[PDB]
Each structure stands twice: as structure tokens, then as C-alpha cells.
Amino acid sequence: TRSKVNGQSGRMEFFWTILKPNDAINFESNGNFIAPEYAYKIVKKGDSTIMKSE
Amino acid sequence: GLFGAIAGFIEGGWQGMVDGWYGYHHSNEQGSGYAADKESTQKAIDGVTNKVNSIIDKMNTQFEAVGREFNNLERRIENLNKKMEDGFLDVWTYNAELLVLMENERTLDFHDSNVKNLYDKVRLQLRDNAKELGNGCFEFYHKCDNECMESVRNGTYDYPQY
Ligand SMILES: *[C@@H]1O[C@H](CO)[C@@H](O[C@@H]2O[C@H](CO)[C@@H](O)[C@H](O)[C@H]2NC(C)=O)[C@H](O)[C@H]1NC(C)=O
Ligand SMILES: *[C@H]1O[C@H](CO)[C@@H](O[C@@H]2O[C@H](CO)[C@@H](O)[C@H](O)[C@H]2NC(C)=O)[C@H](O)[C@H]1NC(C)=O
Hints:
This is part of a larger assembly, with chains A and B.
Chain A: no helix or strand
Chain B: E1 23-28, E2 31-36, H1 38-58, H2 75-126, E3 130-132, E4 138-140, H3 146-154
Antiparallel strand pairs in B: 1-2, 3-4
Helix pairs in contact in B: 1-2
The complex binds a molecule of 2 linked components (NAG-NAG) (2 copies).
Residues 22, 24 of chain A line the site of a molecule of 2 linked components (NAG-NAG).
Subunit structure (chain B): Homotrimer of disulfide-linked HA1-HA2.
Coiled coil (chain B): 56-90
GO molecular function (chain B): host cell surface receptor binding
């Protein structure tokens, strides 16, 4: 039993990983699965930052 | 100042000497005027220039903060991160402010020194051919025309001649 945030007592817990080239990811589930549709290729690596600002 | 010349036995500077930091004022029958001692002056300009660049360049490598975020149950390391970044900023702020204070004092004294040395340079040429008045000035026993004056500024003042 959980308090209602945005009118929901259910929750979603999200996970991630970096799948390296030539490697495979394997899923198995009975239910409650939030499956990937789209994933992001990392094409350009370099200098960046997340800047907090209004 | 440490060397006693600037705002010391030389009471004040000269608005009328525009062309250099240190120099001479002459007064004889032909007239009077200011003349900058360029060499002493250029020496000072090279030293101060080097100083500024030395200061700027020494502060070149210095702490750069990066953004790092932490969840609600990572308060300890969040605090650590903050104390760490603030700590380095305070250290570099101290270094910068103290360097400026210390080197400002040395710059003012440096000028005082250059004046004292220019005064002694002239004193050591003239020796007992002039009265040391005690205010930066030397009153000649002989007439000293413009070529005579120039030889004082030269380093060429022929003492045995007078
Ligand atoms: C898919 O994943 C498999 C292993 O789970 C990867 O292994 C490659 O597969 C072939 C075998 O048929 C090898 O000859 C290749 O050398 C592997 N390729 C590379 C580039 O290492 C498989 O490569 C992946 N599929 C691809 C690359 O099409
Ligand atoms: C400094 O000044 C003195 C005096 O002006 C110079 O000696 C004279 O030099 C001129 C021009 O070279 C000659 O024509 C005169 O015969 C010299 N007279 C006397 C009384 O010295 C000296 O050459 C200068 N030295 C410098 C600029 O280093």
C-alpha cells in the first residue's frame, strides 16, 4: 500500500545498462515487464556537462 | 617606502615628467626642464611586465569544479563533495589574494629602489663638485650648461674637468 502520486498507488522502477558492441542482452519474464522499444547509440563521446539553471 | 626616496627625502613626484617613471630636472642659465632616464625606466617596465605575466601564468593550473549529483540517501558523500570543492576554492582564493598583496608591496618598494639608485648614481659621479641639498637636488659649484647636464644623465660627467 503506497500513497497516491499523480493518482497512482503503483510504482515504476527503471533500470539501465551499456550494451557493448558484439554483446547480446537477454530478457525473461512472467509479468510486470516494461520492455525496451527504443535504445540510444552513443555516437559521439567528448567533453560535456549537465548545468543546473532556470 | 623601504628605500626612503619616494615620499621620503624626495617629497613628491613630478606631474611635468610624462615620458618615463624616473628622471632628471635641470636648471641653469639656458633654462630648465624634465628629462626621463629611459634605461632605468625600461628596466622597471621589463620587471613589472614579467611579474604580471608570472602571476597570471602561475594561476594557470588551478582547481576546476565539476557538477556531481547525489540521491536522498547519499548525504554523506554529497557533503564530502561540497566540502572538497569549497576547500579548494578557498585555498586558491587565498593564494590569489595574498600573492597580489605581497607583490603589490614589492612593486612599490621596487620603484622606490630604482629612484634611490638613480639618485646615488648621480651623487657618485658628482662627488664634491656639487652641494647635496638633501631634497633630491644637487647644486653645482661650476656652471653646468646643457652639454654638462647631459653628461650627468649620460654617466659621462667628467669629474677631473671640474
Ligand atoms: C551477435 O552476438 C554474437 C554473440 O552473441 C556475436 O558474435 C559475432 O559472431 C560471429 C559468429 O557467427 C563471429 O564470426 C564474429 O567475429 C562476431 N563479430 C564480431 C564483429 O565480433 C555476433 O558478432 C553478433 N552479431 C553480429 C556482429 O552480426
Ligand atoms: C652623452 O652626452 C654627452 C654630452 O652631450 C656626449 O658627448 C658629446 O657627444 C657629442 C655627440 O656625439 C659630441 O659631438 C660632443 O663632442 C660630446 N661632448 C661632450 C662634452 O661630451 C656623449 O657622447 C653622450 N653619450 C651617450 C648618449 O651615451
